[PDB]
């Protein structure tokens, strides 16, 4: 149920993606499905999706007081990236 | 008022614009003239044929002399 | 050290000639001028105020890039826009509108 209480201190989060392989395996499908459902369950959290030519697929989270936490997603699958997200939201 | 104020400094004798307004128009007879003064060289001001089909004087763009057509 | 910009000066927007296009040229983006208090002339203090576009005219972006890299100062090459060439027709000028609606 953490997809609704992740907005405690997750103030921003952005997905850096590429328009080619090595990301489309997990990044694009996760982005589509989980973004629809998350923006539904999170009406106020800025979930950015930025894509340029030739970058490694990665997730970035901006926590309160301006702190950046990054995660590389080179060769992960959808379950792995979901666990990565659940681990990003849980900071404590 | 502003141009002569930018360059001239004395403001006791009249500025060039004031003198060239002090000279009256010429009141020529035809429809087209040419301004040099009285010589072709040694006085410059190349040929500047200027029309005269308006009820107001027409300047010359060198040494503005304001020619004017006489009759109707 | 100084950042320089390597570009090709585009065609002047007033004439219609072509003897000054496609000529790679490096500029030192130096702008530190001020007004000489006595008269009003424009003073400066940069030794490279004008040389980059007064004598240094290069034949191609490759040569200018190699030269900037050789003298060491870091560069950033710019892009060169070229006119697309369509097809025109005096008949297309005198085209024919359709029948009345």
């Amino acid at each position: 149920a953490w997809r609704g209480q992740l907005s405690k201190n997750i103030k921003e989060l952005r997905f850096l993606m590429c328009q080619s392989s090595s990301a489309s395996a997990s990044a694009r499908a996760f982005v589509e499905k989980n973004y629809k459902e998350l923006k539904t369950l999170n009406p106020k959290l800025p979930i950015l999706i930025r894509e340029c030519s030739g970058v490694e697929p990665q997730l970035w989270a901006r926590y309160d007081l301006g702190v950046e936490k990054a995660i590389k997603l080179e060769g992960l699958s959808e379950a792995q990236i979901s666990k990565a997200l659940e681990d990003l939201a849980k900071a404590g | 008022s502003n141009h002569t104020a930018k360059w001239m400094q004395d403001t006791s004798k009249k500025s060039p614009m004031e003198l060239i307004n002090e000279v009256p128009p010429i009141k020529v007879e035809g429809r087209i003239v040419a301004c040099e003064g009285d010589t072709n060289p040694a006085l410059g001001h190349p040929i500047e044929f200027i029309c005269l089909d308006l009820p107001e004087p027409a300047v010359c763009k060198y040494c503005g002399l304001r020619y004017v057509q006489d009759h109707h | 050290r100084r950042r320089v910009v390597i570009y090709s000066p585009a065609r002047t927007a007033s004439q219609q000639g072509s003897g000054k296009v496609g000529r790679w040229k490096i500029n030192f983006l130096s702008t530190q001028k001020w007004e000489n208090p006595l008269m009003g002339w424009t003073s400066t203090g940069d030794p490279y105020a004008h040389v980059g576009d007064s004598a240094l005219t290069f034949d191609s972006a490759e040569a200018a890039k190699a030269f900037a890299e050789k003298h060491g100062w870091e560069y950033s090459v710019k892009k060169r826009h070229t006119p697309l060439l369509k097809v025109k027709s005096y008949a297309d000028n005198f085209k024919w509108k359709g029948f009345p609606k």
Binding site: - | - | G19, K33, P47, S54
Partner: protein
């Protein structure tokens, strides 16, 4: 229309191993050669009993800041006996020790020193003594296309603080550069 004779004879009898380009214009006849045989070629001339040059008129440098071989050394030299002059023009890069001719024509030490400081081209044998034209310890070589017209450090004025000093340039009324070009 001047000296086709000497030039033709010189080209048709030369060891053709060391000639890279020949131009028989009417402005001036050019033997563009390789920098490795320059002394050999010049010593062929001044000695052969037909094309004996025996006098070197000029050694000038030309700068082309767009070619891999940046510099261009040029020897203008005439033949007072055969009423003819030729221009032997060699290429030269940044540091590349060029041969000397002060052994043949002793009238090259000053022209080779001048091409040492004005430009930066070296000279392996004797004539590369210290600078001549430019004053003293000088940053660059002030005739290539990089040394700006007004110099790097050129303000030079008296100081009652001590005596006199040289300080970086802060000139007034900067050098205006007009364009004047003409796209036809």
């Amino acid at each position: 229309m001047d000296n086709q004779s000497i030039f033709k004879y010189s080209w048709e009898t030369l060891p053709k191993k060391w000639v890279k380009k020949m131009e028989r214009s009417e402005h001036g006849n050019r033997f563009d050669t390789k920098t490795d045989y320059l002394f050999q070629l010049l010593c062929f001339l001044k000695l052969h009993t037909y094309t004996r040059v025996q006098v070197l008129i000029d050694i000038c440098g030309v700068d082309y800041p767009s070619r891999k071989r940046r510099f261009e050394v040029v020897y203008n030299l005439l033949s007072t006996r055969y009423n003819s002059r030729i221009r032997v023009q060699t290429s030269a890069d940044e540091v590349t020790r060029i041969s000397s001719v002060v052994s043949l024509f002793p009238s090259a030490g000053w022209w080779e020193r001048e091409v040492w400081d004005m430009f930066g081209v070296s000279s392996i044998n004797h004539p590369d003594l210290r600078r001549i034209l430019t004053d003293y310890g000088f940053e660059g070589h002030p005739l290539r296309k990089d040394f700006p017209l007004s110099g790097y450090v050129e303000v030079r004025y008296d100081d009652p603080e001590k005596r006199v000093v040289s300080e970086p340039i802060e000139m007034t009324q900067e050098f205006r550069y007009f364009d004047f070009a003409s796209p036809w």
